[PDB]
Design a binder for these strands. Structure first.
Ligand SMILES: [Mn+2]
Ligand SMILES: [Mn+2]
Length: 425
DNA sequence: ATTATGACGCT
């Protein structure tokens, strides 16, 4: 009872830009705004691979990782923006720079953890305490929450439902207790409305967000009401929400581990996990995963919001699938040079912007017919930002994979260069 | 012949 900690100490938000690459292209080209549109990479093979889809296009069934020619069968009016191509590969620079715009606005409100190019976690605990003291007892007006959904409410037209749920929540709120978790989540949501307003004002970009007590719940909440909306998942809403929540929807359970939870335990939903002791879970899934599952199914997770706005590694990758696989020495060299040239550009810009130097080069390759996604990964020293030297070293480091007797065999279906091990400069 | 990345765990 009194000693079971309930993981309500923090207020954590997950902000995710709605169809981010598409919005970047729609800001740049107004003809695309408020239309079915998608962003593609390459164009020759089946019109190119789609990597981002507006919500209007999604209503027709267009999805990521779908060929553009097939998407056009579902949505003949679909509009397409193409990723920039440089040195024969996709260049994502425009989206990394748009991402930094967004991150820099978010960083004004609270400390953020860049979780991907288009999403960050926010630790709002201090911000909420400060704002609570600023209110000095004033109750929270629904006007301050114009796009917030309260998950699980109403209980007992879409916007009509939203407002009813919010009204029930706010009427139930105990504004005089500055230590109530539910009040703290609520103030966190007010701040997140303000953050999302500043992002849209200063970039034109819309986003969704989740507000809860930890990263996993914030992330799960963010996806409940998209696009352009935010969802508050309270501690108290977890039993009902998790009672029908497929295990695969929880972050890190979408793959093999989640499938083995399902197969070994004979269950489907997150909430069923409550029935197992911690020791049982550790026995099946190992001590770390067991403790984590035992707490997570009760809505409790302790992973911190790391103060990290910048990526930890800077990487350059290209697949050479099918008959385009690289089969000669000249080919492997020239593409290592193209990759190393993009890497040099991004690294020099990174050193100037962020006062740091990478010190290790990671070279990863895939050979044709190899089952694995990395057929090999080897590291060497990264001592100067020179594309010719980095390409020469990556070669030097992979070349004993060639089994020919100027040819290259097995042909290579992927090259990958990654600068890592950053040190302040 | 989804592709381009990027974080993190295991050993
Ligand atoms: Mn997104
Ligand atoms: Mn995202």
């Amino acid at each position: 009872g009194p000693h079971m900690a309930t993981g309500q100490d923090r207020v954590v938000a997950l902000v995710d830009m709605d169809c981010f690459f598409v919005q970047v292209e729609q800001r740049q080209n107004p003809h695309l705004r408020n239309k079915p549109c998608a962003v593609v990479q390459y164009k020759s093979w089946k019109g190119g691979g789609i990597i981002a889809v507006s919500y209007e296009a999604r209503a027709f069934g267009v999805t990521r990782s779908m060929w553009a020619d097939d998407a056009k069968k579902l949505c003949p009016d679909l509009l397409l923006a193409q990723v920039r191509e440089s040195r024969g590969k996709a260049n994502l620079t425009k989206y990394r720079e748009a991402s930094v715009e967004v991150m820099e606005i978010m960083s004004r409100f609270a400390v953020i953890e860049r979780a991907s190019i288009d999403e960050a976690y926010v630790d709002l605990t201090s911000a909420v305490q400060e704002r609570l003291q600023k209110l000095q007892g004033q109750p929270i007006s629904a006007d301050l929450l114009p796009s917030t959904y309260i998950e699980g409410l109403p209980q007992g037209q879409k916007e009509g439902m939203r407002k009813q749920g919010l009204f029930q929540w706010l009427d139930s709120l105990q504004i005089d207790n500055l230590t109530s978790p539910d009040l703290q989540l609520t103030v966190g949501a007010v701040i997140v409305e303000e953050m999302r307003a500043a992002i849209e004002r200063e970039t034109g970009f819309q986003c969704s967000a989740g507000i809860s007590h930890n990263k996993v719940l914030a992330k799960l909440a963010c996806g409940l009401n998209k696009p352009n909306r935010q969802t508050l998942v309270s501690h108290g809403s977890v039993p009902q929400l998790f009672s029908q929540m497929p295990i695969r929807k929880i972050r890190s359970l979408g793959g093999k581990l989640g499938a083995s939870v399902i197969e070994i335990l004979g269950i489907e939903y997150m909430g069923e996990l409550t029935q197992f002791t911690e020791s049982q879970l550790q026995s099946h899934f190992g001590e770390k995963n067991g403790s984590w599952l035992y707490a997570m199914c009760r809505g409790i997770e302790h992973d911190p919001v790391k103060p990290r706005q910048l990526p930890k590694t800077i990487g350059c990758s290209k697949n050479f699938p099918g008959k385009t696989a690289l089969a000669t020495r000249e080919q492997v060299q020239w593409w290592l040079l193209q990759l190393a040239q993009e890497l040099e550009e991004r690294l020099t810009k990174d050193r100037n912007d962020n006062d740091r130097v990478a010190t290790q080069l990671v070279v990863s390759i895939r050979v044709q017919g190899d089952k694995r996604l990395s057929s090999l990964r080897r590291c060497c020293a990264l001592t100067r930002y020179d594309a010719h030297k980095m390409s020469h070293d990556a070669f030097t480091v992979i070349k004993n994979c060639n089994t020919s007797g100027t040819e290259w065999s097995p042909p290579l279906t992927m090259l990958f260069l990654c600068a890592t091990k950053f040190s302040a400069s």
